[PDB]
Design a protein around this nucleic acid. Structure first.
Ligand SMILES: [Mg+2]
Ligand SMILES: [Mg+2]
Ligand code: NA
Ligand code: NA
Length: 326
DNA sequence: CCGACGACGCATCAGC
DNA sequence: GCTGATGCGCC
DNA sequence: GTCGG
C-alpha cells in the first residue's frame, strides 16, 4: 500500500480502457503494471524507478511522474468529467452489463440507477439479478462470513453424496482477510476426463443448496459451471446478510490439480503463469498442462499429481496460495 | 520496428 | 435444430 | 501499453 495512489490511478485507467475504449490489452497492460507495483517493497520516488519493473514502460512512467508531483493525473481528471464515460463506467458495474451493453443503454438515455430500475424488461436475466443485488455485490465478504458459508456448502454437498469434494478457492484459499465473492471447486468420482458415469452432478448440488435457501438466484447454469447468488441465514431480529455472488465449478476428479491451481488465482497470477508457460513451451488451462509441439499444436496431457508439478514443468519454484495474490 | 498479449463456460444471436 | 461468433464473466 | 524477437 506504499504506492496505493499509483496503483489506484493505474487501476482506474485500466477500467477506462476496458469499459470505454474497449481496448482489452490496454486494460491488461495497466492491470499488470499495477500488480507488479503493488508488491514493490519501496515507496516509489520517480517514474524512472518504476520503469525498471517489468510491465512499466515509457507512458506509465510519465504518468507516475505527473502523479507524484501533483497528486493527480490530468488524463483521469478529464475522463472523470466526460459524461459518456462516467455513464458507461457506472453501467458496467452492474453484473451482466459489459462495455457493449453499457454504450447501447446510454444511446437510449438509460444511464442512471433510476433508469435501469424503470426499464427491467430491457435487461436480460443476468442483468436483472445484477441490478437487483447491485448494492450487495459491491460489499466485501469478511473471512468470518466465508468460513460460515464454507461449512454450509461443504456439509450440504456431503448430504447429497458422501463422495463429493468441495473446495473453496479464490482469495479465500489465498488466505485473504476478505473476499469479494465465493469460489467453489467441486469433484465427484463419477465425473472424470474419461467418462461422465452419472448425469446432473452439478444440478443435484445446486438444487440442494437452493432447498436450504442458500442459493437464492441463478445467473447462469450448465453441466460444469454455476454462476449465482447466495445468502447466509440470519437469526431472529437480525438484519439480513448481504446477498453474495457464488461460483461453482465442476471439474473432472483426475484433473483436480490443474483445476484448483486455476480458480485459486489470482486472475493476474494465472495470466502471468500461463504466459510464462508459453515462453517455456507449454500451454496451461484448468484441465491439463500440455506441451507445445514443434509447430504450435498442443500435445497430449502431461502427468500431474500435485499443484507443484505444474510449477515444475515451467521451471517455477512453488508458491503457496497466499503468495499468488498478484 | 511490430506481432502477440491465458484460456475457457454459459447466454445470446445470426446464418443455414 | 445445429454451428459458430460475440458478449460477459470466472480465476 | 509493454515487451521480446
Ligand atoms: Mg473470488
Ligand atoms: Mg467468482
Ligand atoms: Na519496464
Ligand atoms: Na459488468
Amino acid at each position: 500500500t506504499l504506492n496505493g495512489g499509483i496503483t489506484d490511478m493505474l487501476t482506474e485507467l485500466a477500467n477506462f480502457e476496458k469499459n470505454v475504449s474497449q481496448a482489452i490489452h490496454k486494460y491488461n497492460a495497466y492491470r499488470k503494471a499495477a500488480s507488479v507495483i503493488a508488491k514493490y517493497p519501496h515507496k516509489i520516488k520517480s517514474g524512472a524507478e518504476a520503469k525498471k519493473l517489468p510491465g512499466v514502460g515509457t507512458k506509465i512512467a510519465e504518468k507516475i511522474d505527473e502523479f507524484l508531483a501533483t497528486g493527480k493525473l490530468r488524463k483521469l481528471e478529464k475522463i472523470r468529467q466526460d459524461d459518456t464515460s462516467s455513464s458507461i463506467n457506472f453501467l458496467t458495474r452492474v453484473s451482466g452489463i459489459g462495455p457493449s451493453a453499457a454504450r447501447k443503454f446510454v444511446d437510449e438515455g438509460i444511464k442512471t440507477l433510476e433508469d435501469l430500475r424503470k426499464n427491467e424488461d430491457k435487461l436480460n436475466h443476468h442483468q436483472r439479478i445484477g441490478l437487483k443485488y447491485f448494492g450487495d455485490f459491491e460489499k466485501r465478504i469478511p473471512r468470518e462470513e466465508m468460513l460460515q458459508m464454507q461449512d454450509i456448502v461443504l456439509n450440504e454437498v456431503k448430504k447429497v453424496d458422501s463422495e463429493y469434494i468441495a473446495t473453496v478457492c479464490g482469495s479465500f484459499r489465498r488466505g485473504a482477510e476478505s473476499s469479494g465473492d465465493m469460489d467453489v471447486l467441486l469433484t465427484h468420482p463419477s465425473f472424470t476426463s474419461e467418462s461422465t458415469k452419472q448425469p446432473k452432478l452439478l444440478h443435484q448440488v445446486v438444487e440442494q443448496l437452493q432447498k436450504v435457501h442458500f442459493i437464492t438466484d441463478t445467473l447462469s447454469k450448465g453441466e460444469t459451471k454455476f454462476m449465482g447468488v447466495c445468502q447466509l441465514p440470519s437469526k431472529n431480529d437480525e438484519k439480513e446478510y448481504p446477498h453474495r455472488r457464488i461460483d461453482i465449478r465442476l471439474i473432472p476428479k483426475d484433473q483436480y490439480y490443474c483445476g484448483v491451481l486455476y480458480f485459486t488465482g489470482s486472475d493476474i497470477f494465472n495470466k502471468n503463469m500461463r504466459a510464462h508457460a508459453l515462453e517455456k513451451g507449454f500451454t496451461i488451462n484448468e484441465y491439463t498442462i500440455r506441451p507445445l509441439g514443434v509447430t504450435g499444436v498442443a500435445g497430449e496431457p502431461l502427468p500431474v499429481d500435485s499443484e507443484k508439478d505444474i510449477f515444475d514443468y515451467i521451471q517455477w519454484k512453488y508458491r503457496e496460495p497466499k503468495d499468488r495474490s498478484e
